[PDB]
């Protein structure tokens, strides 16, 4: 009962020059800012009617992350980060039932650095519209976790595949799902 | 296929029995390793590895940078917790329970918080052995799901019932099958 | 209106 943890998990990454600032509540994203749009984005739209958080402060708080980043890169005699491969897995929002809206879940977990490529394939063909994802959700052992969502009407006719690619994955990792599940 | 360098700071406030005992914890990580940190109970920075020593020293030298890191547990943790309890600490979403065959499967989905109990009853009496779980499973949308499977001989007349105990609901949920 | 979530201010390293 009520023993909780809130985390401010941010990060900067050279040479990709990308970074993220996000809060974690017992493992769920409360919100995050995109260095890209300079807009804070709550995980559950609603939360934004209960709390406020100006984006800059994060961006601001990131600049220092780069500065410090560099400073540490040198101090470390330019040693590079050791890549760790993702461990993909396919999920379904709920148990699938024909003609009943549902949602495929691509679960990218236990990896690093925070850089990946995910691609949804409905019968070889990739899906580009309607999909969605999470930022880089922080893990306890300090690796990364990510989620990719593709809502859909369950059927036997078509099948799906999640294609994750990582700098620790020799060949693109490929996961399958077909109206069925273990 | 070019090297990458990673700064991973982590400010993690730890609450226990609400706000009665908080614990700040500033933690830095060059690439995936902890270098320098700050425990709110150690009252001052400490390097876990070499790469952080300098960092540990310089911060411990500046009064501000310490008068702050200490003031964390009150002006940051107690603060935020006060702002998000309303919608997180108290968040509660009821489980959607379904039972279908294979081996009997009881599926609990879309619930929150993750605390949960799933029990099987065979003709009115809980079966304590022969169950395979899947453990809690986050979905990244603020709702967990888990499946519990019971291995049995579905004989006629028999009635199986999945019982799901969850803070979201006042009296346990149960769905019977057959 | 609306309570604001404070963020721990990042400090510069040596």
């Amino acid at each position, epitope marked *: 009962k009520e023993e909780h943890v809130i985390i401010q998990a941010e990060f900067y990454l050279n040479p990709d020059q990308s970074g993220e600032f996000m809060f974690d509540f017992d493992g769920d994203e409360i919100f995050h800012v995109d260095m890209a749009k300079k807009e804070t984005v709550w995980r559950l739209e609603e939360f934004g009617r209960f709390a406020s958080f100006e984006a800059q402060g994060a961006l*601001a708080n990131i600049a220092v992350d780069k500065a410090n980043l560099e400073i540490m890169t040198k101090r470390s005699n330019y040693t590079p980060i050791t890549n760790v491969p993702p461990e993909v897995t396919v999920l379904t929002n709920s148990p699938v039932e024909l003609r009943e809206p549902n949602v495929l879940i691509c679960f990218i977990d236990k990896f690093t650095p925070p850089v990946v490529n995910v691609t949804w394939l409905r019968n070889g063909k990739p899906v580009t519209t309607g999909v969605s994802e999470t930022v880089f959700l922080p893990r306890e052992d300090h690796l990364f976790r990510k989620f990719h969502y593709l809502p859909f009407l369950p059927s036997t006719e078509d099948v799906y595949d999640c294609r994750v690619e990582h700098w620790g994955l020799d060949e693109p990792l490929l996961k399958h799902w077909e109206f069925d599940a273990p | 296929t070019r090297p990458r360098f990673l700064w991973q700071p982590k400010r993690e406030c730890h609450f226990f029995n609400g706000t009665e005992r908080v614990r700040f914890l500033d933690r830095y990580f060059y690439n995936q390793e902890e270098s320098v940190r700050f425990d709110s109970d150690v009252g001052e920075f400490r390097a876990v590895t070499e790469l952080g020593r300098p960092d540990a020293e310089y911060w411990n030298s500046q009064k501000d940078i310490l*008068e*702050q890191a200490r*003031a964390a547990v009150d*002006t940051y943790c107690r*603060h935020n917790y006060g702002v998000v309890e309303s919608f997180t600490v108290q968040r509660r979403v009821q489980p959607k329970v379904t039972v279908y065959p294979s081996l009997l499967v009881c599926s609990v989905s879309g619930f929150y918080p993750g605390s949960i109990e799933v029990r099987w009853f065979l003709n009115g009496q809980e079966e304590k052995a022969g169950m395979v779980s899947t453990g809690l499973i986050q979905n990244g949308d603020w709702t967990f799901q888990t499946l519990v499977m019971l291995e049995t001989v579905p004989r006629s007349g028999e009635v199986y019932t999945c019982q799901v105990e969850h803070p979201s609901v006042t009296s346990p949920l149960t769905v019977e099958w057959r | 209106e609306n309570p*604001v979530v404070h963020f721990f201010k990042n400090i510069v390293t040596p």
Partner: T-cell receptor, first 96, second 119 residues
Framework: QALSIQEGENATMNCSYK?????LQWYRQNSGRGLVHLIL?????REKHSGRLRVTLDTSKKSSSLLITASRAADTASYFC????????????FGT | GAVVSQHPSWVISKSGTSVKIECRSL??????MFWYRQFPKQSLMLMAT?????????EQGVEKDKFLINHASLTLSTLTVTSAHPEDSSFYIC??????????????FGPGTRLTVLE
């Protein structure tokens, strides 16, 4: 009822506040003033430098107190403190 | 750093006009600022909070109507009193949280402005 000193006496200004504090700011004053940014006392106690100055925060009774180990002509004024309420916005509301 | 500039320090507008004060910033970015209206003794009073990031603005206590705040810079703000009266004559000081303070809310008040709205 006066700060008798051109050198020494004790400033005894009890500044209070309503909402639970996070940060405590000290601003004593002249007329048409910008400030007096003395020092900041955040939830804790004892931080007061530069002599006539003495910051004593006591959450228990919701009140501070600035004491001056050495009055002067410049240190006579109109003084008050401002505070930011916790788990609120960043707004600061002075006291008295 | 820190510095503040309320353009019209001493401004005179007939009892019935529009006097506009411009709380600006130095070399820091101010996502949010505040307007305090003080008089002879009463402790500096908070009139409203103004913050870019479209979020409107939050007038305090009850003072509600006129006196319109237009924060757009994240540098500047602007307080245009509407109409006018010889009761609105008081001191007008403004602060501006340093967008990067984060916790330890760091604000910096401006010099001030005495609006002389004579009848």
């Amino acid at each position: 009822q006066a700060l008798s000193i051109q050198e020494g006496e004790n400033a005894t200004m009890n500044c209070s506040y309503k909402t639970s504090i996070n940060n405590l700011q000290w601003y004593r004053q002249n007329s048409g003033r910008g400030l007096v940014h003395l020092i900041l006392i955040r939830s804790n106690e004892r931080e007061k430098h530069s002599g006539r100055l003495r910051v004593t925060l006591d959450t228990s009774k919701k009140s501070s107190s600035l004491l001056i180990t050495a009055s002067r002509a410049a240190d006579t004024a109109s003084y008050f403190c401002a505070t930011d309420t916790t788990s609120g916005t960043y707004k600061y509301i002075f006291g008295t | 750093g820190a510095v503040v500039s309320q353009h019209p320090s001493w401004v005179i507008s007939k009892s019935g006009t529009s006097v506009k004060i411009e709380c600006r910033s130095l070399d820091f970015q101010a996502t949010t600022m505040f307007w305090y209206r003080q008089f002879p003794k009463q402790s500096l009073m908070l009139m409203a909070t103004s913050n870019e990031g479209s979020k409107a603005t939050y007038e305090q206590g009850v003072e509600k109507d006129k006196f319109l705040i237009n924060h757009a810079s994240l540098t500047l703000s602007t307080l245009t009193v509407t109409s006018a009266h010889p009761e609105d004559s008081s001191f007008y000081i403004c602060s501006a949280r340093d967008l990067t303070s984060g916790a330890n809310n760091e604000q910096f008040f401006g010099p001030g402005t005495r609006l002389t709205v004579l009848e």
